[PDB]
Amino acid sequence: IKEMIEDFISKGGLIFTHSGRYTNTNNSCFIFNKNDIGVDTKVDMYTPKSAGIKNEEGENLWQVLNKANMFYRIYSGELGEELQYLLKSCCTAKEDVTTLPQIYFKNGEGYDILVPIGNAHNLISGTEYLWEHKYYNTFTQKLGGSNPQNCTHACNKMRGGFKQFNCTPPQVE
RNA sequence: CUUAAAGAGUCAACCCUUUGCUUAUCUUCCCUAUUUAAAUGUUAGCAGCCGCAUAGGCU
């Protein structure tokens, strides 16, 4: 693990639980919110042109950190400060508002500008929960186009694409 | 003051060749239709032409 984490910090080195990369690939906005991360929550991963080194079985950094709270046992801190501090040096905040939706909300006596950006856990728990447990009403999408590995490593890993729900009500006869 | 802002999805096609549905069969017995109505409304133009008839008249 140490050599490819060192390769990651020598690379671009960004981990995130929230992004706008899924809305448009020209996003480059990245924030790791802290209080929403629970034991089964999942996190995606970006480095430039989705590069990396395998762990001698074709295994990159993602399923490593994703597999059953692997990240948690370094985040809670039972693996020592030596790995935990180098992990914490990667989760930085990167701000960008270009080519993103920018909407308003009525707050108390006034309006507030805010940018909707996507969630990390929702896509991966969607691919692993509407699929395995027999929900038979969904749309399968692939982002991006013929080269989907431009966004993230989550984008890179599965090429079947994520799943949304159908929002089609039954209609009047 | 909207996941606000925005975008050509276009094209082409031989499905088709062949076929034994056959063999019989008990529907079957019993019954109160019935009793009283205004056809209202025809109050609708016909054998007709005296008639350029699509304007106006007479038996």
Side-chain angles (χ1 to χ4, degrees), chain A residues 1-39 41-66 68-70 72 74-77 79-80 82-84 86-154 156-173:
Chain A
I1 187 54
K2 265 292 202 331
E3 63 272 44
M4 98 176 79
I5 294 306
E6 279 172 349
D7 177 282
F8 197 30
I9 164 172
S10 76
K11 254 62 182 299
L14 292 172
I15 57 165
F16 60 99
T17 184
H18 275 96
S19 171
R21 204 81 200 211
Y22 314 128
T23 315
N24 196 355
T25 314
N26 300 308
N27 155 266
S28 282
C29 194
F30 274 140
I31 166 62
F32 204 147
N33 189 16
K34 294 293 177 67
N35 54 355
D36 47 356
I37 309 301
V39 189
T41 49
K42 294 183 171 292
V43 162
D44 326 293
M45 214 224 78
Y46 166 43
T47 196
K49 318 163 310 171
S50 284
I53 322 194
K54 324 321 300 175
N55 207 77
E56 305 97 74
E57 39 256 24
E59 187 37 72
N60 54 356
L61 197 47
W62 197 56
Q63 261 101 316
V64 160
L65 255 350
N66 270 65
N69 11 277
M70 252 32 137
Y72 240 63
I74 189 175
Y75 222 48
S76 54
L79 261 77
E82 145 193 60
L83 263 172
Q84 186 261 343
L86 166 46
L87 182 92
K88 284 291 188 71
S89 62
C90 167
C91 41
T92 81
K94 173 77 178 298
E95 74 291 338
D96 200 338
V97 303
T98 68
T99 36
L100 314 175
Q102 288 199 321
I103 59 167
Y104 295 154
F105 263 112
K106 199 66 132 66
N107 216 0
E109 198 65 33
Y111 83 110
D112 196 2
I113 167 66
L114 81 180
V115 49
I117 87 163
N119 209 348
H121 195 8
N122 284 139
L123 307 165
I124 324 290
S125 184
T127 36
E128 285 134 9
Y129 205 105
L130 300 103
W131 223 347
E132 190 42 68
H133 324 109
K134 313 312 142 193
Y135 184 20
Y136 286 3
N137 208 15
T138 167
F139 290 154
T140 313
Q141 66 96 24
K142 281 161 254 282
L143 40 76
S146 90
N147 299 106
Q149 72 287 6
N150 282 246
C151 22
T152 64
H153 261 263
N156 198 1
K157 189 41 73 73
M158 81 305 298
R159 311 290 206 86
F162 308 135
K163 272 194 170 62
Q164 325 88 337
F165 327 108
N166 294 12
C167 286
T168 298
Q171 285 97 334
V172 46
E173 53 100 5

